[PDB]
Design a protein around this nucleic acid. Structure first.
Ligand SMILES: [Mg+2]
Ligand SMILES: [Mg+2]
Ligand SMILES: [Mg+2]
Ligand SMILES: [Mg+2]
Ligand SMILES: [Mg+2]
Ligand SMILES: [Mg+2]
Ligand SMILES: [Mg+2]
Ligand SMILES: [Mg+2]
Ligand SMILES: [Mg+2]
Ligand SMILES: [Mg+2]
Ligand SMILES: [Mg+2]
Ligand SMILES: [Mg+2]
Ligand SMILES: [Mg+2]
Ligand SMILES: [Mg+2]
Ligand SMILES: [Mg+2]
Ligand SMILES: [Zn+2]
Lengths: 153, 49, 108, 308, 217, 115
RNA sequence: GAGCUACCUAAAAACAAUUUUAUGAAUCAACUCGUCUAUGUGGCAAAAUAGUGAGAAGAUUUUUAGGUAGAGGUGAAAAGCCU
């Protein structure tokens, strides 16, 4: 009976879970694109989004600095969070991270894998799933339906 | 008025940079020893080949 | 508790060939438009993704040389330029990573 | 491959048409629902008077939550909130074709999406002219109380002072041991017990050399249909169609429940003073107040209760 | 702008409509009876009608030690010692038989829960029954009483020294040796305060409610 | 919630409940079909090598809202006939004793303070 | 066959801190032992683990080499130990 609980049980315990997640978050901020097991990447996605919000609060905020200090073990990253990532995501209200499933791991444990990144990074674009064009057969028929309904009141 | 933490390596991590910081921690004890005997004792107490 | 009787191959064949124990056939396998290799509908193409990361490793390798050591991450945005490209006015005051190869067609 | 492939509604939709389809489906839901607002003007089936031994149709409601309620005597009653959402009569079976003793009506509530449903269910609703509903339940209704399919049902069907029966699936607790499932005592924690603390004791006696059918054993608990009998109705909110029911109702919040007049012998014939087929807002002989109260209930905004 | 705690919805999967229905009843009662602003640690006098008696009310004075409950079910507990006997009553704010709620002394305390006053000396829980209300100043902040009470011998109702309770209003030095404070910190769970998914932001929710309450007025 | 072997406080002016013989009286029996004793429930008391009836007038266990939760388990000694052993009670007594089923008027006459 | 174990011979070793009438004294490590409980029961182990406990300057513990052999040896006698 684990109804309503919003966390995975990871690592050696609750504290170990935080540290495992913290290490992934630290890697994500530095490199902006990280591969982990799909479950662990999903666990860390929420923290990645909330960290940007703390960065938006501002450099001078004391709580933001303490939060940034705890989560970014490599302390050179803290300037990056407040002066690079937060300015980038000023317009958005959320959805800063992009997470997609990668083919399973070829390492005899066949782990389910994911790629987690921050949006807007400098790295080569991921091969995202592109929806079909309006020129396809089904789309054109729907486009015809849309035009008639809009034009005819 | 932003108090960024200093950009230094971890004290406890298993890395080369972290170990070097632990080296400086031990060496500071020598710098802070008033007597010449303590400085020699600290500098020579650990035996290796 | 220990077995009272040997289990016959007739019983055993019913256990290990029951449909519940068989490998399910997958209906979500599709062919990738760009590379022409196989993929699952909900999963990224492994061939195309393989191209992206290996280019990423090349970029990150160049980054490591420029920084030269740990704890040297910039406080300004980064940008990657390939041979035959020069920083624009908007590119001013941003770390530039230089790659010997030409700009990949897919990378823009 | 010349083989079967899996598809979903969004697979071949472009970004532009992806939003268009959602608006198109949402628009149709509104049109169909409005078309059914006026039943009396749509060839209603003949209206019959109430007579002893009659059974009306029931409703399907969503379980909102609980709150405290006070009566003019100062006693506090925990009450559960039941909201009727898109309750409509869907299908009618005559007395002969369902059960010789009584007729049946199928009533559905809680409009749901049309995208991940079997075509058979979608075909059923298309003829009926309604959007699909999450749950169907069957109500035994006497012939005089039969209602035409497609007729909207509202919370004002019930009235305060009326006792009612609620049935829903209980909260699912998964596989459980005998201590939690059947209230077994277990075994002592200390004094030498070797790996026996929450276990069943002896299954049966040795003489019969077997285990009796129905023996209480560890297994999956909850997620079963259960009924609560004789819950009073304290108040009804006409604007939002909320029924206030005494006590607890099986299931979790946001779960659909089946509500019908109580079958207890004491409340044998309560339909005498209730809308006999159902309550029709279309008639609007007198527009109902926003909130209907039971006499004992102490309404908010009343003066403080002094036991004078 | 002081928003009463009960109005804040707790996180969960409940529909927001359930809260709108409850708020309408809550605000309607507040029109009939005025519920004053108060915090844990403030002294309150509550007048309630006794069902046992006939048209005869009762008054209880005590320090508020806990606030709990949301919606129409909100409650508060206030404590006092009467002829040397400690008594606590848990009061439902919206119970129809509460005639009046009077904030004899409005003040705030270092901790938002004062259940440790059961283990503190009797003086810290005794309050004069007939004490008259003290004046309050609108153009001020609520006074934050920083009293740190003295505890009685170590056997306590709870292990208040333990980090989970997070007690900041007890003189632990007088009652506990430095080793015992060290031994307590083994329960510290330091990571709790720094994990961002355990924090419920009610700023926007509190904001939207404020105008809604004011708008109805 | 008074049980068997619970230590209780004699809130009365009776001789048997005085502080001499510090050993607190202990409950031998609860006169309920359940063995749990709440406010208004009689109990049998082991006091000074004697067996005496007592009536629970307060206890530390949380009850229903709007009712007083005390800091000690209080009792009043009751004679076999039912007359209270002591003639005065000074500690507050909950008013709920009035309505609940039983014979409690005699005790309420003895107690000045109600809370 | 005494590289285990029992006892002995020779040559060696270890014992912090804290108190004490100055020691087969006290508190308690290292070290030696193995009280009680749970686990384990083809186990990590053909006797262990985890806690909890006993002694801990002595009739103490430990190392190296030698000695006593079955009608026997050794034994602060458990008819215990001698691969
Ligand atoms: Mg879950
Ligand atoms: Mg209740
Ligand atoms: Mg479950
Ligand atoms: Mg038990
Ligand atoms: Mg056990
Ligand atoms: Mg048989
Ligand atoms: Mg306790
Ligand atoms: Mg030897
Ligand atoms: Mg020594
Ligand atoms: Mg000694
Ligand atoms: Mg000892
Ligand atoms: Mg000793
Ligand atoms: Mg010996
Ligand atoms: Mg013998
Ligand atoms: Mg013998
Ligand atoms: Zn591809």
């Amino acid at each position: 009976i684990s109804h309503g609980r919003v966390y995975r049980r990871l690592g050696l315990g609750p504290e170990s879970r935080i540290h495992l997640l913290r290490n992934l978050l630290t890697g994500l901020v530095r490199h902006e694109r990280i591969e982990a097991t799909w479950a662990r990447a999903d666990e860390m996605r929420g923290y990645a989004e909330k960290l940007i919000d703390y960065g938006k609060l501002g450099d001078t905020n004391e709580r933001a600095m303490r939060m940034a200090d705890f989560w970014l073990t490599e302390k050179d990253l803290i300037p990056k969070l407040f002066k690079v990532l937060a300015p980038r995501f000023q317009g958005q209200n959320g959805n800063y991270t992009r997470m997609l499933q990668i083919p399973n791991r070829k390492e005899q444990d066949r782990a389910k894998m994911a790629v987690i990144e921050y949006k807007g990074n400098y790295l080569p674009p991921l091969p995202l799933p592109h929806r079909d064009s309006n020129l396809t057969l089904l789309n054109q028929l729907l486009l015809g339906l849309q035009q008639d309904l809009h034009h005819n009141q | 008025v932003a108090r960024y933490p200093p950009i230094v390596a971890s004290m406890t991590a298993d890395s080369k940079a972290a170990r070097q910081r632990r080296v400086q921690r031990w060496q500071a004890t020598v710098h802070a020893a008033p007597s010449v005997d303590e400085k020699i004792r600290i500098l020579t107490k650990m035996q290796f080949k | 508790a220990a077995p009272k009787n040997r289990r016959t191959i007739e019983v055993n064949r019913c256990r290990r060939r029951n449909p519940q124990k068989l490998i399910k056939i997958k209906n979500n396998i599709d062919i990738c438009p760009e590379c022409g290799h196989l993929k699952q509908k909900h999963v990224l193409c492994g061939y195309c993704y393989e191209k992206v990361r290996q280019e990423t490793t090349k970029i990150r390798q160049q980054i490591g040389a420029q920084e030269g050591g740990p704890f040297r991450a910039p406080s300004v945005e980064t940008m990657v330029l390939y041979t035959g490209e020069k920083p624009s006015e908007k590119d001013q005051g941003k770390r530039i990573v230089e790659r010997n190869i030409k700009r990949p067609s897919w990378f823009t | 491959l010349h083989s079967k492939s899996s598809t979903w509604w969004d697979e071949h939709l472009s970004e532009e048409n992806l939003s268009f389809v959602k608006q198109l489906v949402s628009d149709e839901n509104k049109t169909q629902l409005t078309s059914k607002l006026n039943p009396l003007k749509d060839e209603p089936w003949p209206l019959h008077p109430w007579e002893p031994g009659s059974f009306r149709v029931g409703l399907i409601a969503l379980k909102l939550g609980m709150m405290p309620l006070w009566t003019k005597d100062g006693q506090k009653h925990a009450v559960t909130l039941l909201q009727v959402q898109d309750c409509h009569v869907l299908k009618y079976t005559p007395k002969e074709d369902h059960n010789g003793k009584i007729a049946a009506l199928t009533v559905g509530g809680k409009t749901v999406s049309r995208f991940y449903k079997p075509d058979s269910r979608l075909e059923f609703y298309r003829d009926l002219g309604l959007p699909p509903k999450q749950i169907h339940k069957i109500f035994h209704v006497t012939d005089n109380a039969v209602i035409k399919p497609g007729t909207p049902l509202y919370a004002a069907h019930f009235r305060p002072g009326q006792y009612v029966d609620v049935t829903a699936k209980t909260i699912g607790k998964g596989f459980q041991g005998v201590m939690k499932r059947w209230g077994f005592k277990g075994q002592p924690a200390s004094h030498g017990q070797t790996k026996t603390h929450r276990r069943p004791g002896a299954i049966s006696t040795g003489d019969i050399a077997r285990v009796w059918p129905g023996t209480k054993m560890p297994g999956r608990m909850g997620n079963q249909n259960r009924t609560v009998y004789g819950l009073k109705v304290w108040r009804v909110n006409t604007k939002h169609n909320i029924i206030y029911v005494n006590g607890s109702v099986p299931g979790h919040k946001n779960c659909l429940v089946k509500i019908k007049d109580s079958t207890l012998p004491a409340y044998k014939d309560s339909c005498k003073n209730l809308p006999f087929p159902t309550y029709f807002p279309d008639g609007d002989e007198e527009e109902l107040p926003e909130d209907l109260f039971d006499e004992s209930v102490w309404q908010p905004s009343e003066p403080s209760i002094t036991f004078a | 702008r002081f928003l009463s705690p009960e109005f804040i919805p707790p996180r969960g999967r409940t529909n927001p409509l359930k809260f709108k229905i409850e708020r309408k009843d809550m605000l309607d009662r507040r029109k009939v009876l005025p519920i004053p602003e108060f915090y844990v640690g403030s002294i309150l006098r509550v007048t309630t009608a006794d069902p046992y008696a006939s048209g005869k009310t009762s008054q209880f004075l005590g320090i508020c030690i806990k606030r709990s409950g949301n919606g129409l079910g909100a409650t508060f507990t206030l404590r006092n010692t009467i002829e040397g006997q400690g008594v606590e009553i848990c009061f439902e704010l919206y119970n129809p038989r509460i005639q009046e709620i009077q904030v004899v002394k409005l003040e705030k305390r270092l901790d938002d829960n004062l259940l440790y006053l059961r283990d503190a000396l009797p003086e810290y829980s005794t309050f004069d029954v007939n004490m008259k209300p003290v004046p309050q100043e609108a153009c001020q902040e609520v006074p934050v009483n920083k009293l740190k009470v003295k505890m009685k011998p170590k056997p306590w109702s709870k292990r208040w020294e333990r980090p989970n309770f997070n007690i900041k209003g007890i003189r632990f030095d007088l009652a506990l040796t430095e080793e015992q404070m060290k031994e307590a910190q083994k329960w510290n769970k330091p990571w709790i305060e720094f994990d961002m998914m355990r924090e419920y932001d009610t700023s926007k929710i509190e904001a939207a409610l404020w105008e809604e309450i004011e708008a109805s007025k | 919630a008074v049980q068997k072997m619970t230590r209780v406080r004699v809130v009365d002016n009776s001789a048997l409940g005085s502080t001499p013989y510090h050993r607190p009286p202990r409950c031998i029996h609860v006169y309920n079909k359940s063995g749990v004793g709440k406010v208004g429930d009689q109990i049998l008391l082991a006091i000074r090598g004697q067996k005496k009836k007592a009536l629970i007038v307060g206890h530390r266990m949380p009850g229903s809202r709007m009712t007083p939760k005390f800091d000690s388990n209080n009792v009043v000694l009751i004679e076999d006939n039912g007359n209270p052993v002591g003639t005065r009670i000074k500690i507050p007594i909950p008013t709920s004793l009035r309505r609940r089923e039983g014979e409690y008027s005699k005790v309420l006459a003895i107690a000045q303070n109600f809370v």
